[PDB]
Amino acid sequence: SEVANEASRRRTFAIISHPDAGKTTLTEKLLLFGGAIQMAGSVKGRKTSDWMALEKERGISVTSSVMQFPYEDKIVNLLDTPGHADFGEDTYRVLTAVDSALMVIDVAKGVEERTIKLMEVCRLRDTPIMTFINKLDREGKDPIELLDEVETVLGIQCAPVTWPIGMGQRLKGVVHLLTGEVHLYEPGRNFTRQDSTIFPSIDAPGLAEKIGAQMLADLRDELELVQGASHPFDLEAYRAGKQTPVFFGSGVNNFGVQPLLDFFVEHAPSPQARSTTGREIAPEENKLTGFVFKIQANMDPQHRDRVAFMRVCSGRFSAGMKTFHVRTGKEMKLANALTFMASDREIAAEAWPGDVIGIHNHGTISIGDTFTEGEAVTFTGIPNFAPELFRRARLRDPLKLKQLQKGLAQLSEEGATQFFRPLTSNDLILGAVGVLQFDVAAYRLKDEYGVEATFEPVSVTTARWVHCSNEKKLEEFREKNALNLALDAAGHLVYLAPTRVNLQLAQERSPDVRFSATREAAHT
Ligand SMILES: Nc1nc2c(ncn2[C@@H]2O[C@H](COP(=O)(O)OP(=O)(O)O)[C@@H](O)[C@H]2O)c(=O)[nH]1
């Protein structure tokens, strides 16, 4: 069928990186291959009018959230993961609306703090991971050691697919480990199809006349070790999230990028079956389905447009179709909704399973909302994430407590911020993932709700959701740790911890108590 075909082309993925790894550099070089030259320049330019400044305050992002582009007859949906000033909870959430992930690692650094946390988010869905080691034009760690670093630190098996030849001032090129080809690193080239120097084999004549006899011999030495030690690429493993094919390159020069992109579109998974409150929803179904996973402000001179982001999981979207908002129950007509075909010639008014659409939100869409054509079904798997920045609410005029908690609880629905009411206090504690969510709730509470407020930091570092079967044994825990407990906007029990250390002690004192770092956004 027409849907099954279009879904089979889709490659929906995001990049996970520690900052300054190369995420925006490597995004540009791929937008080049998709023919999105116009967007490619604005993404590199992302490194002023008065009303756009106020819009920066309301929560818009300069870089486009979603970048779709075609490559080798596949449709590549590249969902952004803002890592800089706009880092926040939405960054963690984007990963739950993809099927595959590309990890970028600086070779000088290695695995880094943001690498580790993003990779943990991918472990939740067992998302497949591909690895690209960046910045080989400058000196860095040994590849053999960097593989063990990934393996031991990140926990995932390593199956390299390309392999470097030197690095830094001494970099000569990569060697493909499946095709046997030997791409060369050299100037004046964009490293594309016709614009590259590719030997078909290591034993091809003249290779030593190009990479030096010494470096060819040391390359034979390194391969013999990788062959008899590192594991070869097992697609079944990669698909189950238990293995990552590794690529080495130099994104700033587009070197090694294309082999990665060709390998990616060949093997990365097409849209798969997600789960709902009961039955599994396959991507080949006739009716349209999908879940809202992100809500942001859309660049608006009226400073009033919010757009909820929705990934499509079955059927076909067409501009102006009647949808079924399972929660509210009202028929919703997706009017003037947003597609993200970023290409100077290509322009498409529809979207297929794996794509993302932008539903202009007027206030009644919250995170995790499931849109269908009439089937009462509700997607599961959409998580809320344990905050990592906590602050208390500071209101100058106390006559706005009624309206403050009204605004706050709604900002929780739309994913602005989480909102915690301690069992032994009327304080209101706002958990976020990035600093920016606080300035946003500031403006939004003032602008929308008229509550001039402030957020002073508290002695809270991490939070865990609490669940336990035994009704009495939980109450022996509710009254024991009550000072450290709160309720969130959903009414779940949250252990607000002053430190990671206090939490581990808390986890051990209560052996029969579940401490989980995630929670479904559907009040359950
Ligand atoms: N030497 C070298 N520098 C790079 C490479 N890729 C990115 N950079 C540099 O890293 C800086 C910004 O990297 P960026 O793409 O913005 O990483 P991001 O912050 O994770 O998006 C720039 O100064 C780039 O010149 C590379 O392959 N080699």
Can you characterise this structure?
By secondary structure, this protein is an alpha+beta fold. The protein folds into three domains: 1-17 and 47-101 and 268-381, no CATH class; 18-46 and 102-267, no CATH class; 382-524, no CATH class. Helix content is 28%, strand content 27%. It has 15 helices and 31 strands. The strands form eight sheets. An eight-stranded antiparallel sheet has the order 26-23-25-24-28-29-27-30. Strands 2-3-1-4-5-11-6 form a seven-stranded mixed sheet, with helices on both faces. The chain has a six-stranded antiparallel sheet with strand order 18-17-21-14-15-20. Guanosine-5'-diphosphate is lined by residues 17, 19-25, 83, 134-135, 137-138, 250-252.
Alpha-beta classification: alpha+beta
Helix fraction bin:
25-40%
Count, helices: 15
Biggest sheet strand line-up: 26-23-25-24-28-29-27-30
Structural domains: how many? 3
Radius of gyration: 25 Å
Report how far the terminal alpha carbons are from each other. Answer: 36 Å
β content, as a range? 25-35%
Tell me about the largest β-sheet. Answer: 8 strands, antiparallel
Topology:
Blueprint: H1 2-9, E1 10-17, H2 23-33, H3 37-45, H4 50-58, E2 66-71, E3 74-79, H5 89-94, E4 100-106, H6 113-125, E5 129-134, H7 143-154, E6 157-160, E7 162-165, E8 173-176, E9 182-183, E10 198-199, H8 208-211, H9 213-227, H10 235-239, E11 243-248, H11 257-267, E12 274-275, E13 280-281, E14 289-297, E15 306-314, E16 317-318, E17 322-325, E18 331-333, E19 350-351, E20 356-361, E21 370-372, E22 383-385, E23 389-395, H12 401-413, E24 418-422, E25 429-432, H13 436-449, E26 453-457, E27 462-467, H14 471-478, E28 485-487, E29 493-497, H15 500-509, E30 514-516, E31 518-520
Parallel strand pairs: 1-3, 1-4, 4-5, 5-11, 6-11
Antiparallel strand pairs: 2-3, 7-8, 9-10, 12-13, 14-15, 14-21, 15-20, 16-19, 17-18, 17-21, 22-31, 23-25, 23-26, 24-25, 24-28, 27-29, 27-30, 28-29
Bound molecules: guanosine-5'-diphosphate.
Guanosine-5'-diphosphate is lined by residues 17, 19-25, 83, 134-135, 137-138, 250-252.
